[PDB]
Amino acid sequence: MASVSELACIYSALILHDDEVTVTEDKINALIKAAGVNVEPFWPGLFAKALANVNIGSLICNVGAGGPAPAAGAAPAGGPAPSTAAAPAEEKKVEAKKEESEESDDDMGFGLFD
Amino acid sequence: AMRYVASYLLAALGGNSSPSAKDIKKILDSVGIEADDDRLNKVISELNGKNIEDVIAQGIGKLASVPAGGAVAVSAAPGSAAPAAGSAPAAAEEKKDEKKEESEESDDDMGFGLFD
Numbered sequence: 552m553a554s555v556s557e558l559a560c561i562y563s564a565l566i567l568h569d570d571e572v573t574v575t576e577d578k579i580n581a582l583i584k585a586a587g588v589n590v591e592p593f594w595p596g597l598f599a600k601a602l603a604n605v606n607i608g609s610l611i612c613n614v615g616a617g618g619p620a621p622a623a624g625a626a627p628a629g630g631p632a633p634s635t636a637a638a639p640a641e642e643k644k645v646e647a648k649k650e651e652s653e654e655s656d657d658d659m660g661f662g663l664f665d
Numbered sequence: 666a667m668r669y670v671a672s673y674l675l676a677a678l679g680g681n682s683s684p685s686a687k688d689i690k691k692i693l694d695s696v697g698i699e700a701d702d703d704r705l706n707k708v709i710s711e712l713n714g715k716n717i718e719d720v721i722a723q724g725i726g727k728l729a730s731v732p733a734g735g736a737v738a739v740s741a742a743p744g745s746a747a748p749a750a751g752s753a754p755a756a757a758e759e760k761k762d763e764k765k766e767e768s769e770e771s772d773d774d775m776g777f778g779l780f781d
Binding site: 566 | 667671672674675676678679680681691692693695696697698699718721722725726728729730731743748750751752767768769770771772773774
């Protein structure tokens, strides 16, 4: 390899990608300083003033245009988990006569139909 | 997903073909990023002496940044207060006059009593 300039700037770029850190001139310059490489201030300056909102793979073609980046999201799930049932309920209703009546006759052929 | 790969690249491309995990950390910490020493050395020992010139020349994809894994974010399991057997409600000041009612649903009370 010989493209150390754009290499360092690109590695610095993607290292500053989307973390607790910010994609800024100071930060690329700091990473380049941290490694001890040589890149012309044009790359770090341009990169820091051009990126900061340019997803990630963008930097592969930032010299031409770039492009978007697809994303995804996770959806929660669950459900009801029943436990135990039924409880002793000793009740009693006041009833004496059952299926009977204190009046009964022929009880048949009554004119109550249409 | 990104790791410490481009940080290794920072070390190597810096002009020092000698993987100092400390210096990978140094590059991460230089600007203020929460890098972990174990994780970085582990990915470094996974990448130890691998395709450097290749990852440099045509490997601008998965390099270095937020360490892959997610590290728990917005996630929980449905495990709240365990329900009672079915009786004993949580009344405000349940301490006044023991009351036995409990009438809702009944389906077979076993109908026994051989307890002796």
